[PDB]
Design a protein around this ligand. Sequence first.
Ligand code: 9EB
Ligand code: R92
Ligand code: ZN
Length: 258
Amino acid sequence: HHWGYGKHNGPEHWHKDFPIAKGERQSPVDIDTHTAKYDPSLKPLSVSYDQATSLRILNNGHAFNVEFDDSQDKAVLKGGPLDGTYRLIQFHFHWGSLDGQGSEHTVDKKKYAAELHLVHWNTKYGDFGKAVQQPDGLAVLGIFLKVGSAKPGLQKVVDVLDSIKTKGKSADFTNFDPRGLLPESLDYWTYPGSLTTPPLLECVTWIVLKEPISVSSEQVLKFRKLNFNGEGEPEELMVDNWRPAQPLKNRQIKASFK
Ligand SMILES: C[C@@H](NC(=O)c1ccc(Cl)c(S(N)(=O)=O)c1)c1ccccc1O
Ligand SMILES: C[C@H](NC(=O)c1ccc(Cl)c(S(N)(=O)=O)c1)c1ccccc1O
Ligand SMILES: [Zn+2]
C-alpha cells in the first residue's frame, strides 16, 4: 500500500509515511501574481542545454522520466536566483484527466493542463542523492502546458509512450533535445520549496516560467493513455498525477519581471 494519487493513497495520505508533507516549505503553491514581488536583483536564467545527452525514457509508475547523462557539465542551469551550477538529471510531467486540471503550481488559482519539471542538482554536492539532503540541493524549472497548437519538440516523447505504456518499462531515448520544450520568454517566479512527490524533501529552488508552452489535444491525449499499473495488471490510466497547492507559510515568491 505505497503512495500514489488515489482516494486511499493520494496526496491527503502522504503525511503518514512522509510527515514533512505538512512542513514549512512544501510544493507546489499557488502563485498570487499581484503579491509576488519584482526583484530587480534577480539575474536572467541561464539555460545551457546544447550538449544535453538524453539517454532513456522510463515509466516509473507515477509519471514518465526522460533521463539524462549527468556525469559531466553538459546540460546546466545557472543564474536566475541560483548560486553555482545545477546539472540536468531528468524531466517529467504532471497532467490531468481533462484539460482544466493537471498542473501542480497554479497562477491566481488557474490550473493548466499539465506541468513540465526539468530537475537539476547542485554540483557542489556531487550527485543527486546527496543534493536532496540539502536546502539548496535542487533547482526545478517548471513550465506550464496549455492545450492549443502542437509543440513539435514534444512529439518525439509522445511517440515513444506506446512502448512504456506500463510501469517499469523503459526505452532508449537518445539525442533528444530539451530546448524544444522551452517557451520564448525565460521570465519566471521563484520561491524555496520541496519535491512535489514523496519523499517531499525540502531541497528545491523552484523557478516557474510565466509563459506556458502550447501542446495539442492529441499530444496530451497520448499522455492520458499511459498506465500507472504494470503489465498484466488491471488498467488504471495515468491521469491526475498532480499534488494540489500547499500552504505558502512563511515564504515570499519573487518575480524576475515587472
Ligand atoms: C515520482 C518520482 N519523482 C521524481 O522522480 C522527482 C524527483 C525530483 C523532483 Cl524535484 C521531482 S518534482 N515533481 O518535485 O519535480 C520529482 C519518484 C520516483 C522514485 C522514487 C521517488 C519518487 O518521488
Ligand atoms: C515533430 C518532431 N519535430 C521536431 O522534433 C522538430 C523539428 C525541427 C525543429 Cl526546428 C523543431 S523545434 N523548432 O521545435 O526545435 C522540432 C519530429 C521530427 C522528426 C521526426 C519525428 C518527430 O516527432
Ligand atoms: Zn514533478
